[PDB]
Amino acid sequence: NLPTAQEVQGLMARYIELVDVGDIEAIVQMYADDATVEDPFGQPPIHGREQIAAFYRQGLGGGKVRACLTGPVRASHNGCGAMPFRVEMVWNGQPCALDVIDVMRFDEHGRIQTKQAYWSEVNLSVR
Amino acid sequence: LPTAQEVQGLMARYIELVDVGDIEAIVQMYADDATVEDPFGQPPIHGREQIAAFYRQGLGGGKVRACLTGPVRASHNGCGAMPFRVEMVWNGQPCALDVIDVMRFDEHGRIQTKQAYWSEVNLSVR
Ligand SMILES: C[C@]12CCc3c(ccc4cc(O)ccc34)[C@@H]1CCC2=O
Numbered sequence: 001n002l003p004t005a006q007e008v009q010g011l012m013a014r015y016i017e018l019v020d021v022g023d024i025e026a027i028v029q030m031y032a033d034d035a036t037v038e039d040p041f042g043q044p045p046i047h048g049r050e051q052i053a054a055f056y057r058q059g060l061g062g063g064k065v066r067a068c069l070t071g072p073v074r075a076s077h078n079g080c081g082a083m084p085f086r087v088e089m090v091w092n093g094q095p096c097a098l099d100v101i102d103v104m105r106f107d108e109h110g111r112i113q114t115k116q117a118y119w120s121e122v123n124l125s126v127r
Numbered sequence: 128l129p130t131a132q133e134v135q136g137l138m139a140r141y142i143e144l145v146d147v148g149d150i151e152a153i154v155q156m157y158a159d160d161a162t163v164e165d166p167f168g169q170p171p172i173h174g175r176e177q178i179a180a181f182y183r184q185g186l187g188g189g190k191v192r193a194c195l196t197g198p199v200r201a202s203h204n205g206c207g208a209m210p211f212r213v214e215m216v217w218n219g220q221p222c223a224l225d226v227i228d229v230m231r232f233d234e235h236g237r238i239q240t241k242q243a244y245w246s247e248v249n250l251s252v253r
């Protein structure tokens with residue numbers, strides 16, 4: 001069914017846990033088959049599980065990425081939510097952190113129909 | 128179109144105005160045809176008087192407080208998203224509400240759309 005607000009919080013928290021462990025195929029299964037991803041928001045959307053899988057493989061497949069919520073998931077009553085988090089990876093061969101906000105809309109099957117990831121280089125820190 | 132750094136400044140200024148409760152200054156931040164969806168999932172509000180009435184009803188008691196809970200996330204196409212918390216008293220129960228605002232600005236630096244993500248799951252009693 002279309003996720004309630006509590007169900008949205010649970011799904012978006014699970015998504016972060018899958019990012020953190022690097023489980024590309026489980027992430028892709030969270031998306032609807034024809035989902036759209038804009039990441040970073042402002043760039044051309046990518047469409048569909050094949051393209052989304054390739055995107056997450058390029059992003060997470062090389063060198064350790066960690067991710068964690070930095071505050072609660074904010075959920076709506078129409079199957080949408082937004083969440084703040086941080087990702088830690090390597091940049092310039094050194095540890096770096098990136099602050100992100102993800103906005104997601106879910107479909108009536110509980111799958112991610114759209115994701116917009118808000119971030120730019122103003123959100124990238126080091127040291 | 129505001130740069131990502133300008134977006135950070137503007138969205139943080141918006142929170143500052145909400146926290147002091149200056150309705151007129153908040154409304155002046157919006158573009159002529161702006162839309163407000165707050166909470167996201169509700170029908171959009173159009174119109175300067177309508178946006179002013181909305182902030183009057185929300186903040187008109189002077190006691191609402193608001194602070195960023197993390198940095199503004201800003202794009203290169205004049206949009207941004209920010210996490211914050213609002214504190215207020217609801218029929219005698221002191222409460223706090225976690226919110227994320229997503230904003231799109233125009234080429235004059237004014238808010239064209241605001242979408243406020245929150246619901247009752249984000250409400251707490253302090
Ligand atoms: C891909 C990324 C790691 C993961 C990640 C980045 C940016 C936005 C994201 C949004 C997500 O919903 C999940 C993961 C990321 C990073 C940007 C650079 C980088 O290394």
Ligand SMILES: C[C@]12CCc3c(ccc4cc(O)ccc34)[C@@H]1CCC2=O
Nearest residue numbers: 145165185191213215224226228243
């Ligand atoms: C209106 C409100 C106070 C302020 C506020 C609420 C919800 C979303 C907001 C979004 C904003 O960008 C600025 C202020 C609010 C509150 C919900 C209940 C309440 O008292």
